[PDB]
Subunit: 496 residues, 2 copies
């Protein structure tokens, strides 16, 4: 099964309204930059962002000139002429619109609250899809809270129902309409809906994990924003999943959610796989086509795991653009984020940066010794390890934010495509290293075991192992006289 | 309110069938040993044991001579002439009949299963009570678990309904018929039904905690079997309550159920008080009138906290009776348990025992240095502390197993009565020591706390405290933009005044 390669195409409204393919000062990344070859390396383009309005329907931002927008979307759907598997999805949400303190947060909450609002919303999603010529719906609410989860689930189910009907009405059995969400890639946000993950994922083709932004200036210690595995020298974090409303026992929680833990890509993937009903084939790993930069860092560790003096507020609370060599930063008025495109130029520009490598996390970083700067980012080398993990763990594919941040040659996207599909690329000897793996155990990833059948009437000592009801069970204390499922002394530890 | 003093009267079927008050080789403890004075010191006697038969009704052991059973019971109920507050309860169950592997366990499980079975069972309990002349029902099922607990609760509720009606019917409002149960006194068995404790206690006058047998030859390390408070030097245990189906978060479970912990009387009492809807006045502290003995012990701490070479299996699998001076142990064929009566004789018999005291646990112990023996037991001195605790914690009173194990003069019973009621006993200056207290805190026993109201639209940092919807809540991490508190990030830590 081909791995998904899902790239976000993000275009602000003002660029839609002044769309040109011939003036990078005004549209830095027009659709013509997605050449036939790039189009064939993608399986999905997530056109981003639409919103939910005060009518509680899916909708464009109101300042959008519609003719321009329809024109931009038509350029994207024309790309399917080059790749008959390509889908142009549209995204609803994103952080700006849907975070808890976000300008449209209330509509997210309200759209999913009643059967009626859920049917109105779901219909509006399909209507927009069909009117503009999109191939599916990607919902990026960051993030429904436990109260809202049942309504969000019901909304996803309704959209799935409608999309499946529309696939049959449109003869699209060869390329059915799809439904995806952007999912949390870290335990803190994931804990909002984690307990009902199976229900959330059932209506989806893919859950695209935002396994990036795991470090940033809002954290006191500099760190890798998308470490594949952990580094014991790096910071560790409270495992918020142990507080989710699971109804699990203390042993079950502890075994599933070691705390503190390393906030890594592997952690997020394994946390999903720990739940029953979450198939690996639906999990897509997100990767960033940008780096995060920090100032006021100290020496010793190449800028890693340092205090820093980087404001965390949005917007950037000042006019000081201190990321030496970053032209895009001054245009975008924020020195804390830089595209891969720009970082590559900075690095080869003699600006004082050193590119280093963490062989535990399998990610690169830049250190600027003169100025005390640190940058965490991803590149074609870190993507070798991430692609090997996607294959080894039987994940659905990769997602990235965003296409316009690749270099002009499209090298990050090409690398992803190469690692999954090139007949002359061989990663059999790629060493995945000794970084820390997430070792929790949950109902969804119990190890296969054998044990003698439980015998009623028998008394068992502590640590005794039995098979019962198709699982392997262990006693937590001694003199156990009733059965697994019926005596809390038994812990489910394996699967027959 | 007078403290309850609840004494078990246990008589096996063969002793009923051969009952005599003039031959202690046949009946070691006839009812005649209970004098008017002892009767006045008791509030309840639990006559023990009746059972549940395969017809799922309350019944005597079918081997019982019914005439003889009625005569024994009459001797007990005649004691009410001396104490107008005294109740002769009868007990249904006990370990032998009702443990999971016990001879009648299925009948317990099945009697409580349906409204019809519960009605027939409850009606049989009141019938027996009235036919033999008892004053109430004590259910001693050791112990319901799992799917049985809802049945058990509904059974208790039905017994209560029928007893309250019987009270009116009979004109017994001055001494209404009562309902009690024997409850687990340690967390492993308590975990079976702990989550539903409030529903179990609602229909009861008292829950009598079996806060003994907390040590024994079945455990690898010698210890006190009824320590009041903990000793850091002694063994600690897994806190099984953590595995009860409570729906609490990891933080909630950890704060309520420290682990490992000291398996003590105080721990059981506070574990009960941790649950919402469990009144202290209904909790009765059990105490043992017997000790437990171990052989093969080491000497650095008077035999305490030692490995040992004592079989833990039952019955005693050997013919070797090694508890020096314990002729009772010979008669009963088990050197690992001895009545207070017998232990006190051993102490007067110059056999080589040393009586020692642990000032943390507030319990005595015997050490035989020559033979490597250790005995854990309770006496009138440990009861001073336990009675003071019952007063301070506002418990309902004391229960003990069993009357027959007191000395012939009834000194342990007289001591409990003294400590609760005597004018000339003053425990105001009794120092309860520095032994370890159980200090778990449950979402049902949160302290009053004070914090600023939660402000929507506010971002809160880790460890911030706010008041919201009747509770004080703490954040477990930062950048919290959600409201308290099913939300994972908020921990209920206190109650708003």
């Amino acid at each position: 099964t081909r791995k998904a390669v899902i790239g976000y195409y993000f275009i602000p409204t003002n660029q839609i309204n002044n769309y040109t393919e011939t003036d990078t000062s005004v549209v830095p990344f027009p659709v013509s930059n997605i050449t036939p070859a790039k189009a064939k390396q993608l399986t999905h383009i997530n056109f981003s962002f639409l919103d939910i309005n005060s009518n509680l329907e899916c909708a464009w931002d109101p300042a959008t000139n519609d003719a321009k927008a329809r024109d931009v979307v038509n350029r994207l759907t024309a790309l399917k002429a080059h790749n008959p598997s390509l889908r142009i999805m549209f995204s609803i949400g994103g952080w700006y619109y849907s975070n808890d303190l976000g300008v449209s947060h209330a509509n997210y909450v309200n759209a999913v609250k009643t059967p009626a609002s859920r049917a109105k919303f779901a219909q509006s999603c399909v209507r927009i899809m069909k009117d503009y010529g999109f191939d599916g719906v990607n919902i990026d609410w960051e993030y429904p809270q436990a109260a809202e989860v049942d309504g969000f689930i019901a909304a996803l189910q309704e959209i799935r129902t409608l999309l499946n009907q529309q696939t049959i009405t449109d003869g699209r059995q060869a390329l059915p309409y799809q439904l995806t969400i952007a999912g949390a890639g870290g335990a803190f946000f994931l804990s909002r809906y984690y307990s009902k993950l199976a229900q959330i994922v059932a209506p989806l083709d893919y859950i695209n994990l935002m396994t990036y932004d795991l470090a940033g200036p809002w954290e006191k210690v500099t760190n890798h924003q998308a470490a594949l595995f952990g580094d014991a020298a790096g910071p560790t974090f409270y495992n918020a999943l142990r507080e989710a409303n699971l109804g699990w026992s203390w042993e079950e929680l502890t075994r599933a959610f070691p705390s503190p833990f390393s906030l890594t890509v592997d952690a997020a993937v394994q946390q999903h796989l720990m739940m029953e009903g979450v198939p690996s084939a639906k999990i897509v790993m997100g990767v960033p086509f940008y780096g995060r930069a920090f100032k006021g860092v100290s020496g010793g560790n190449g800028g890693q795991y340092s205090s820093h003096s980087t404001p965390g507020e949005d917007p950037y609370p000042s006019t000081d653009y201190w990321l030496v060599g970053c032209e895009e930063c001054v245009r975008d008025k924020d020195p804390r984020i830089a595209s891969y495109r720009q970082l590559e130029q900075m690095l080869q520009g003699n600006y004082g940066y050193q590119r280093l490598w963490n062989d535990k996390t399998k990610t690169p970083y830049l250190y600027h010794a003169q100025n005390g700067l640190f940058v965490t980012y991803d590149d074609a080398e870190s993507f070798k390890y991430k692609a090997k993990y996607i294959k080894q763990q039987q994940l659905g594919g990769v997602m990235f934010w965003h296409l316009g941040q690749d270099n002009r040659n499209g090298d990050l996207l090409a690398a992803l495509d190469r690692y999954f599909n090139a007949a002359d690329y061989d990663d059999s000897q790629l060493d995945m290293g000794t970084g820390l793996r997430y070792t929790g155990v949950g109902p969804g990833n119990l190890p296969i075991m054998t044990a003698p059948a439980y015998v009623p009437g028998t008394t068992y000592a502590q640590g005794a192992l039995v098979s019962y009801q198709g699982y392997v069970w262990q006693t937590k204390w001694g003199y156990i006289t009733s059965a697994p499922g019926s005596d809390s002394a038994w812990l489910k530890v394996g699967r027959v």
